[PDB]
């Protein structure tokens, strides 16, 4: 149960317990996971008076390629305990690409334990700095709307799907966050873009009591706000007569919204009078919820260009930055949320796992052994290696962080990265120029409708016979079935190589399936990626996904606004 003062004092106690907690964390991790096969290769049985030393002296640092076969084994019909243990409920994918190939990583309920405690922790620190009403709400542009089963029959996916569909999410987050504006259905609605507009709407419907605006990214907020600048005429009209726009066509959400709709003339007059005042949207974020005392986002790294427009969006509202870490292994919590975006430093939490940092100080790159958490010298930049329950043991994620200070007994971490740049020939191609090419040429059909395609990803299914490649699209707006059917056909027509033709024209692999998804899905992808515990080098996102990709994988399915195989063929 939530409290700020005790929770902060146990944090002061824990952070001060940084070495003790990191090592004990190792102990529970090894003891819980003694049976792992890599470990048998490694020669480890637990206990001993050199558990940490044995830890760093017996098993080599793993890479995604080496990880991929076993994890592949956990997902493709052989429910198999591997580099972690018990068959994981869901699986993850990290930024960059494993040889350009997709990457698969383990998930467990511990991700929820850590997630819950971290948000409780952070909300306590933030509300400490930024107090909120007990009876208010939070504008959360959050989404976890897609559920599907991988080929093996084991669910595979995103941190968000699992975090909001987890039985514990509603109960766990009810006390420590302000009541969500959006009905859980709209959040889990089969149409995310329609859900973004609706989310804007829901978010916009009780603002008098809003404590803050939420998106995990400054650019996320940027999307919601530019989109805000992309639909309020329609918004006022939809809400005005009490009849929602023809733009949204999914029944669960439509029925849900119509439950809360009636004709009200005046509000239009009001909304209309104020938003005109903005000189072109200067700091409208405070204006729409006049009482939020902050803007919650991740505004560093790949987002540094985006904070000013968010500031441009936020106006004079303070910018608070999100804690760092993922289900892959959480890392740090922002003890000092009120800090400026250009100086945001986040405090590592000790039991999330056991991490080590690989230095860069020789030239580029150099050869120094990984050293202890506080052993890391101030001011220099170290890449991050982590051992946790996330199934990832001693793995090189290849991204650099800089330590600038210490909170109590723990270090403070800052990031300046962009992309985790080590790339090798990818197999989920269809040369990326061609994948991008396909999206570009086909999307022109969607470009006739005053909307430009935003982002995309592709998939390969070995379950179906013949297997069908699945391409997904993030876009500016809603359109009917015919055009997207033409778009699928066009993607098919687009990969110009002699091979794709030999196959598909032959029949050995099925008609390319265009499962047009909804907007923000890639945005979610970005949002979980930059946030992962490592360093800011986490945004060169994967184009095509094979059996081994996962984070785009829960996202692809339930919210397929349109799922169609080529009319051609």
């Amino acid at each position: 149960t939530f409290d700020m003062n005790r929770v902060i004092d146990e944090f002061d106690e824990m952070t001060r317990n940084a070495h003790q907690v990191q090592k004990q964390t190792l102990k529970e991790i090894l003891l819980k996971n003694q049976s792992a096969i890599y470990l048998q290769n490694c020669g480890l049985n637990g206990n001993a008076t050199d558990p940490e030393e044995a830890f760093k002296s017996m098993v080599p640092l793993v890479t995604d390629v080496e990880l991929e076969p076993y994890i592949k084994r956990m997902v493709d019909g052989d429910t198999s305990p591997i580099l972690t243990g018990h068959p994981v409920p869901a699986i993850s994918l990290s930024s960059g690409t494993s040889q350009g190939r997709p990457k698969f990583i383990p998930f467990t309920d511990e991700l929820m334990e850590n997630t819950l405690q971290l948000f409780r922790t952070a909300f306590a620190f933030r509300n400490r700095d930024f107090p909120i009403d007990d009876n208010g709400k939070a504008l959360q542009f959050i989404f976890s709307s897609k559920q599907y089963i991988s080929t093996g029959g084991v669910p595979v996916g995103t941190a968000t799907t699992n975090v909001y569909r987890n039985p514990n999410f509603k109960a766990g987050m009810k006390s420590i966050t302000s009541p969500s504006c959006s009905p859980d259905e709209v959040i889990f609605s089969p149409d995310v873009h329609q859900a973004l507009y609706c989310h804007l709407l829901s978010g916009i419907l009780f603002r008098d009591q809003v404590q803050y605006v939420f998106a995990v990214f400054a650019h996320g907020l940027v999307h919601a706000f530019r989109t805000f600048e992309q639909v309020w005429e329609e918004i006022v009209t939809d809400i005005k007569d009490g009849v929602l726009s023809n733009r949204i066509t999914v029944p669960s959400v439509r029925t849900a919204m119509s439950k809360l709709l009636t004709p009200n003339p005046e509000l239009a007059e009001t909304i209309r009078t104020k938003c005109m005042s903005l000189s072109n949207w200067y700091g409208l974020i405070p204006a729409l919820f006049p009482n939020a005392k902050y803007v919650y986002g991740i505004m560093t790294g790949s987002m540094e260009p985006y904070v000013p427009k968010l500031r441009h969006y936020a106006g004079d509202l303070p910018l608070v930055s999100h804690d760092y870490g993922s289900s892959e292994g959480w890392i740090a919590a922002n003890v000092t949320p009120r800090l400026s975006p250009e100086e945001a430093t986040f405090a590592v939490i000790p039991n999330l796992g056991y991490f080590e940092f690989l230095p860069v100080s020789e030239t580029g790159e150099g050869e120094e052994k990984p050293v202890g958490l506080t052993q890391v010298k101030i001011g220099e930049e170290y890449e991050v290696v982590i051992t946790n329950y996330a199934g990832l043991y001693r793995y090189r994620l290849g991204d650099v962080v800089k330590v600038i200070g210490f909170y109590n007994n723990t270090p403070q971490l800052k990031f300046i990265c962009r992309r985790n740049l080590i790339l090798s020939i990818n197999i989920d191609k269809n040369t990326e120029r061609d994948l991008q090419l396909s999206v570009e040429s086909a999307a022109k059909r969607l470009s006739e409708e005053k909307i430009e395609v935003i982002d995309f990803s592709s998939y390969i299914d070995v379950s179906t016979d013949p297997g069908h490649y699945a391409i997904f699209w993030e876009i500016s707006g809603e359109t009917n079935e015919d055009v997207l059917q033409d778009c699928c056909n066009c993607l098919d027509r687009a990969f110009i190589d002699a091979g794709y033709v030999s196959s598909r024209k032959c029949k050995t692999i099925g008609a390319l399936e265009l499962r047009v998804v909804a907007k923000g899905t890639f945005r979610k992808i970005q949002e979980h990626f930059l946030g992962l515990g490592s360093s800011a080098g986490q945004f060169k996102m994967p184009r095509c996904v094979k059996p081994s990709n996962a984070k785009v994988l829960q996202i692809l399915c339930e919210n397929v606004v349109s799922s169609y195989f080529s009319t051609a063929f």
Partner: protein, 214 residues
């Protein structure tokens, strides 16, 4: 060659069998007529008259846990069941004893009873199921880096997961894909490949046990 006093449906005997096979020994499997128990059985464990009972060199080892431990110690040269540390052996022991006490009784309720014991039995099944899953953290096996003592103790129950699946009117997998699936991974090794009798056979005779007494 070692003589295994075993029963076709008995889980624990299945543990014995999976253990000897997993390690790397060639032994003889003996089925039994409880109606007409063999002279060897009656001499080997007269009071209990229960299986498993392995006669090795002329020395009979009853009990599945006792027999798996025995397979381990008489022949501990390649695929060791227990971890080297005493506390580790301890964890395997505590957990194996665990599948064998509360879990066993409850599943016993899930296939052999009616009325309230059935409903109670299913509930205890889930509550128990999460706990074993809960201690697991995320461990591929239980006893050692590969096949283990606790692992040996609970694997035979993999056969019974299908029975619980329909008879218990429950899904051990939808709520806990983890355990049954763990068993599926454990079904790639030859030991469980041939040790555990067909899932369908176990379920049908189980229903039959229900038919024979009221």
């Amino acid at each position: 060659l070692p003589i295994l006093l075993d029963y076709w449906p008995s889980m624990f005997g299945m543990r014995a069998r999976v253990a000897l096979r997993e390690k790397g020994v060639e032994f003889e499997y003996r089925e039994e007529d409880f109606s007409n128990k063999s002279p060897l059985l009656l001499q080997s464990n007269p009071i209990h008259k229960k299986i498993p009972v392995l006669v090795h060199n002329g020395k009979p080892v009853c009990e599945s846990l006792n027999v798996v431990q025995y397979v381990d110690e008489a022949w501990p040269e390649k695929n060791p069941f227990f971890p080297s540390d005493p506390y580790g052996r301890a964890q395997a022991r505590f957990w194996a004893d665990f599948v064998d006490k509360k879990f066993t009784d409850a599943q016993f309720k899930v296939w052999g009873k009616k009325g309230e014991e059935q409903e109670a039995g299913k509930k205890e099944f889930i509550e128990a199921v999460k706990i074993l899953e809960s201690e697991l953290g995320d461990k591929p096996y239980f006893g050692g880096d590969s096949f283990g003592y606790v692992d040996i103790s609970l694997i035979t129950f993999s056969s019974w997961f299908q029975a619980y699946e329909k008879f218990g009117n429950f899904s051990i997998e939808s709520e806990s894909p983890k355990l049954i699936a763990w068993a599926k991974r454990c079904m790639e090794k030859e030991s469980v490949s041939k040790s555990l009798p067909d899932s369908e056979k176990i379920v049908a005779y189980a229903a039959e046990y229900r038919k024979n007494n009221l």
